[PDB]
Structure 1
Amino acid sequence: MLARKSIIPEEYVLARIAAENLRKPRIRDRLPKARFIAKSGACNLAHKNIREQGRFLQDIFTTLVDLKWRHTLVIFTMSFLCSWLLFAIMWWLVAFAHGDIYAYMEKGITEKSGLESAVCVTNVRSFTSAFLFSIEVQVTIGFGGRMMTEECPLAITVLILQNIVGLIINAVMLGCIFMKTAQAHRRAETLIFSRHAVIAVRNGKLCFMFRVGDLRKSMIISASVRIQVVKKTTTPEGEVVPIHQQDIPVDNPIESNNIFLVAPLIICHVIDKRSPLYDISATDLVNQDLEVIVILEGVVETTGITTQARTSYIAEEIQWGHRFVSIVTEEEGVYSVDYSKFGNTVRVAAPRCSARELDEKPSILI
């Protein structure tokens, strides 16, 4: 309640370490980082201010088909209960109006009559009975202690309406269940990537290498490897290409971009003149605004669905001077690989100059 009524203390003295410590930097960088796509898929761009196209109910149905299995049962059950209840209320009103409730109550209070010759819908006497008759009509049970005599045509209209709507509900729900059962192999994607990237020395020039593997016992067919470099450039005439993606060859025995993926692999990329990696040196490759994307494509023979797997690399994670330990080893009777040595890298003799000069100064020595 009015904590600071006494406002008098102002500018008496503060005079302190707020930033005038002089031995601690005043600045707080806070280290925010932005990458073209996150380390685990999920391309993180920012679309906004797009001319919207409104919505349409077909999109609501489209949502209905794509639900987790713990909600389809719930919507199923709610749909069924609501339908039974709604038609029970309609039947109860019909029974009320035609004078059937009064007739049954008056001639059953005194059992002398036993008259059921003039009634709209036999043996409907309460809302409980109406909500058990509607059950007997919707699910095609038909217990049949409650016939529908032929007279009151409003009841017959209600029966036609309800039978057809019930069939619609049954057909749609069966369709949803079948569609979700057919596309049930389609769990998710499980492509495992090495995180750290080396630049070793091999075959007279540098490289760019990482490791990739699968987990599903089905290998992936017609797998293709694409590697791109993301950087901002301008034309020599000077136009801002905001985030230019440049395609770079991935080496192979015949220069083609398929790869066969059973035991994990090294994905080399020889740095040559056209490659944007011509101009990057050892102490340089900790400071740079670059993002190298890797795009893997294929199909899984089991489910028969095309899959695309994405990852992203920045200059900060890449650690010059290393290579990958030979994960494989000829075992007692059959090859094997320990994925536990996935992110493990070792260091070996690494020249510190730039491939820009590794042909300029023609000595394999640096």
Structure 2
Amino acid sequence: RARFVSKKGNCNVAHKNIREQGRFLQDVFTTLVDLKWPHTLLIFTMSFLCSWLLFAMVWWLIAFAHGDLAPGEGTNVPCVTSIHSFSSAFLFSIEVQVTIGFGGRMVTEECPLAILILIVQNIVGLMINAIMLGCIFMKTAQAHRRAETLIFSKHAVITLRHGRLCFMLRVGDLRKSMIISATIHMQVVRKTTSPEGEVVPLHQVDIPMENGVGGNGIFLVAPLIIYHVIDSNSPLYDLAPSDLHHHQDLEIIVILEGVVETTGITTQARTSYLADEILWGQRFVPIVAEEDGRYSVDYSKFGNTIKVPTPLCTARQLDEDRSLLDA
């Protein structure tokens, strides 16, 4: 069966029959940022080589039409000096676009269309150069490889915490960089049938993360347990321990967003638990241990999830049993 989001955040949806009005390339610039680094290299080098070949074309053409490729050098003045071939023209063009300009073949005061062409060549060079500089600055500040090291426990566990069923995962920030203002959103992706007769195929219901402040935000330095209280008025209320098998239509996506501390750019790390990934009656093994003089975190036991006796039944039946024991 298909899932919504892979275990590595790679979303699994396929988009079909997209009427594009040229909007995917009217944004040439974020398209040119998102081109993978080899693709960006090849676009970079194409846009330079083609420009040089173009203006070398023009230069050789002018020197032809100016009568500067005929022998008989001494009598007349070249429009730019000692262009002898399309090799000379290609080198002269390179030297004036990349501004090395050895000056062996320098433009002279002689014929204006060369002056005008050399203006044009400098200006388009400046233009494309600044365009590529900026695009690959935007590409130097891409923070995709930072969300590659924010990790989630492979198994999420439902355990009895403070007398209530709680659904927990564990997340960890491997680097020293504090991904500032981290915020976590969890949604139970499950097909929902409406009492009025509406069935939506990938319905997403946000489940509230349990916090003392009543918000969705974590201070992530040591790997921490993100848990959700399944008391009531939220999905998973009727999650029996039997319904946790492979082909059960039940997924939970988690998505944590925050700016990286260093490049100051928001990023997002996401993962998903299918009904088989989520274990019942387990609790996460402790990780932090007070070492010599610090709080040493052991990532070996990150997702071990020791099992512990929990009442195997739905949370609704748990509340019903509490109500019956009370009265």
TM-score, structure 2 as length reference: 0.83
Superposed displacement of residue 266, structure 1 = 1.5
Is the strand fraction higher in 1 or 2?
2
SS at match of 1:269: strand
Q: Distance in 1 between matches of 2:27 and 2:105?
A: 44
Q: Distance in 1 between matches of 2:61 and 2:22?
A: 40
Q: Distance in 1 between matches of 2:300 and 2:274?
A: 24
- Which of 146, 152, 163 matches 2:119? 163
Alignment match, 1:344: 304
Alignment match, 2:256: 296
Alignment match, 1:307: 267
| Correspondence list, 1:115-264, <5 A | 115-117=74-76, 123-134=82-93, 137-138=96-97, 139=99, 141=101, 143=103, 148=108, 150=110, 155-181=111-137, 184-188=140-144, 189=147, 190-264=149-223
Q: Which stretches in structure 1 are left out of the alignment for 5+ residues?
A: 1-32, 106-114
Superposed displacement of residue 67, structure 1 = 4.4
Q: Distance in 2 between matches of 1:103 and 1:181?
A: 48
Q: Distance in 2 between matches of 1:262 and 1:277?
A: 29
Structure with higher Rg: it is: 1
Superposed displacement of residue 268, structure 1 = 1.9
Alignment match, 1:282: 241
Q: Distance in 1 between matches of 2:320 and 2:150?
A: 40
Alignment match, 1:318: 278
Superposed displacement of residue 204, structure 1 = 1.2
Superposed displacement of residue 193, structure 1 = 0.3
- Which of 20, 41, 44 matches 2:9? 41
Write out per-residue CA displacement over residues 333-363 of structure 1, whole angstroms, 9 at most, x where no aligned residue: 2111111111211112122232222232338
Superposed displacement of residue 214, structure 1 = 0.7
Specify the code of the residue in structure 2 equivalent to 1:235: S
Specify the code of the residue in structure 2 equivalent to 1:213: G
SS at match of 2:113: helix
User: Is 1:206–1:270's contact at 8 Å kept on the other side of the alignment?
Assistant: yes
Q: Residues 144 and 332 of structure 1: is their aligned pair in 2 closer, same or farther, counting only changes over 3 Å? A: closer
Q: Distance in 1 between matches of 2:219 and 2:249?
A: 32
User: Is 1:329–1:336's contact at 8 Å kept on the other side of the alignment?
Assistant: yes
Q: 1 or 2 for the larger relative contact order (CA 8 Å, sep ≥6)?
A: 2
SS at match of 1:332: coil
Q: Distance in 1 between matches of 2:282 and 2:76?
A: 97
User: Is 1:76–1:173's contact at 8 Å kept on the other side of the alignment?
Assistant: no
Q: Which stretches in structure 2 are left out of the alignment for 5+ residues?
A: none
Say whether 1:335 aligns with 2:295. Answer: yes
SS at match of 2:317: coil
Say whether 1:358 aligns with 2:321. Answer: no
SS at match of 1:209: strand
Q: Distance in 2 between matches of 1:257 and 1:146?
A: 65
Query: Which moved further from structure 2: 46-55 or 295-304?
Result: 46-55
SS at match of 2:229: coil
Specify the code of the residue in structure 2 equivalent to 1:349: P
SS at match of 2:268: strand
Specify the code of the residue in structure 2 equivalent to 1:157: L
Specify the code of the residue in structure 1 equivalent to 2:304: N
User: Is 1:295–1:310's contact at 8 Å kept on the other side of the alignment?
Assistant: yes
Percent identity of equivalent pairs = 62
